[PDB]
Design a protein around this ligand. Structure first.
Ligand SMILES: CCCCCCCC/C=C\CCCCCCCC(=O)OC[C@H](O)CO
Ligand SMILES: CCCCCCCC/C=C\CCCCCCCC(=O)OC[C@H](O)CO
Ligand SMILES: CCCCCCCC/C=C\CCCCCCCC(=O)OC[C@H](O)CO
Ligand SMILES: CCCCCCCC/C=C\CCCCCCCC(=O)OC[C@H](O)CO
Ligand SMILES: CCCCCCCC/C=C\CCCCCCCC(=O)OC[C@H](O)CO
Lengths: 299, 304
């Protein structure tokens, strides 16, 4: 419709990402959770409950042909989170961001194998400025046994992150899936996969978990669940109206203003290299915006 | 000359750079010289002497209009060396290579202000892959830690001045060559002849001239070594002036940056020494930069 198109999705995805970040560190802080998949299962329950309440007050659709075709997308999503968490267990945050910025390039070249586009030299220049940014951020920061665990799990996160955004955006365009339908299938079908994943990788010790996962944590999972409502709708909107590359680019660009806020609002020590990485990352988004503007007038 | 065109100049500039590197570390090694400008003055004397002998056996030209127009080029050259040496005094080698790769971008955008071209998005992609390479080489290195901010400070000023003088030199030299149809033997002659007084004046201002304390250091051994390194510099001085002319100021600075990679790969192949994956990765990223830069130039020919 009127507002379901163009850069509105980007601005909305950004705002929803900002709201989710401030809620997780100010409202529902100290969320160093022992049962992350259970937390995401409650987050996906809140999103489903909101969707059903909003449908009976006005949207979306329920099926079984679309369900068996959407199941790999939902499986890829849960596996993407699993490989990401396992990669971050052994790998450092600035290092994780390098490979996460490297996925943008294979998502860009992967979209040429899925939709038949072309990665213009200017888009390729921006992706390189995004890698440069993540590298100078790591550069400005402080054994074979420790090497291989983190790197293997990062390689698997790279392929799952790519396949997920590429296959999801393919099915949406194939089954004329509007935003609210995409949000629904992603959260409804995730519910069993999130449960099955938690049983295989998390501890379920009765009394030792009842005192930790009490009324306080339950309230916190619901509040973080309410915060995730926007971003879950917006990510599925972003991929659809723009592209899988633009979504992963906007996602990488979003980390910069929250990092700049830490430098502005909080009296904390920093090096010039970490400050430089933020502005290199900005130049990447600026020239990526021009690259898209160039495509319109050249196609 | 006919075979005085295209990639032949690049191959020649590369080979002459290789010969100069192997001579300085195998033939005339232990060249940790106290009087570097005096060494370059003998190198420029050898080049001049070779040019005069070869002219009377067969070339070039002698003038006064071209001399006052080539004087800033020769001054920029000696100043380029002075700022480079002063930058390297405070700044680490992998760090120096980052800014040296960053000059390629301002040489590329500077050539648009001098010749009126265009830095195609593909060329811009290659320059970024060249910066990426130098950065991951510095990242995968621990030689940067050299020994309060009262110890490390003037390095970045001397590096910034080297960046502008390296750019201006290659941009103004190529401009004059194309203007005065200078070919190659004239560009080599005017660079070395006009450098002679500037190299002398620079050595008097920044180097020690203590009589007996230098006579025993700068003996018959060092004199022979300056002549041999002077013979090695004959090729590269002709080829650099050839490269800038037939290709471009950007291609010359790109080929110059690309040249450091095969000599580094030779160190990994020929010599049993320890290394990290990042330093190995930087070499192949640098190769991808040259490969996509070659395609970028091939794209320009069919699109102009
Ligand atoms: C273990 C960690 C490994 C880290 C690895 C980092 C180095 C790879 C970086 C970039 C690849 C770029 C290659 C693809 C670009 C080729 C040029 C291209 O496709 O340009 C546009 C085209 O010409 C339009 O027609
Ligand atoms: C392929 C790239 C990604 C890498 C592969 C990721 C995993 C693949 C999925 C399922 C494996 C089977 C999981 C089901 C079995 C549970 C495994 C486990 O943790 O078993 C311990 C057991 O529960 C103690 O009682
Ligand atoms: C030490 C680390 C602590 C970090 C503390 C985090 C605090 C986050 C709060 C507010 C910033 C939110 C960002 C607000 C500005 C967003 C601007 C925006 O979206 O700009 C798009 C632009 O206009 C397109 O051209
Ligand atoms: C030591 C000092 C500690 C201080 C700690 C403060 C933490 C940050 C708080 C608020 C920033 C949030 C601003 C978010 C508003 C949205 C950004 C924006 O662009 O707003 C424009 C307009 O007003 C609406 O769109
Ligand atoms: C210790 C190391 C510190 C340094 C770390 C590396 C710094 C990299 C920053 C910038 C690259 C230069 C700018 C690249 C080009 C910017 C965009 C531009 O100029 O675009 C015009 C183009 O023609 C449109 O197609």
């Amino acid at each position: 419709s009127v507002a379901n198109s163009g850069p509105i999705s980007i601005l909305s995805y950004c705002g929803s990402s900002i709201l989710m970040t401030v809620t997780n560190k100010f409202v529902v802080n100290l969320k160093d959770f022992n049962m992350n998949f259970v937390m995401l299962f409650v987050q996906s329950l809140v999103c489903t409950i909101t969707l059903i309440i909003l449908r009976i007050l006005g949207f979306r659709s329920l099926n079984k042909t679309d369900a068996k075709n959407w199941f790999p997308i939902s499986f890829l999503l849960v596996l993407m989170i699993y490989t990401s968490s396992k990669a971050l267990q052994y790998l450092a945050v600035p290092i994780y961001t390098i490979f996460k910025n490297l996925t943008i390039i294979l998502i860009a070249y992967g979209e040429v194998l899925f939709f038949g586009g072309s990665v213009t030299s200017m888009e390729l220049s921006s992706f390189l400025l995004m890698v440069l940014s993540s590298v100078v951020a790591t550069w400005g920061d402080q054994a074979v046994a420790s090497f291989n665990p983190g790197y293997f799990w990062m390689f698997t996160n790279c392929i799952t992150s790519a396949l997920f955004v590429l296959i999801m955006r393919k099915r949406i365009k194939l089954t004329n899936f509007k935003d609210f339908d995409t949000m629904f299938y992603n959260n409804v079908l995730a519910l069993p996969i999130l449960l099955l994943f938690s049983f295989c990788v998390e501890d379920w010790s009765s009394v030792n978990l009842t005192n930790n996962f009490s009324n306080d944590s339950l309230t916190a999972m619901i509040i973080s669940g309410v915060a995730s409502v926007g971003i879950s709708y917006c990510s599925g909107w972003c991929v659809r109206v723009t592209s899988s590359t633009t979504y992963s680019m906007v996602g990488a660009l979003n980390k910069l203003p929250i990092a700049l806020s830490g430098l502005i609002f909080f009296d904390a020590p920093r090096n010039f290299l970490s400050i430089l990485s933020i502005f290199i990352g900005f130049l990447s988004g600026i020239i990526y915006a021009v690259a898209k503007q160039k495509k319109q007038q050249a196609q």
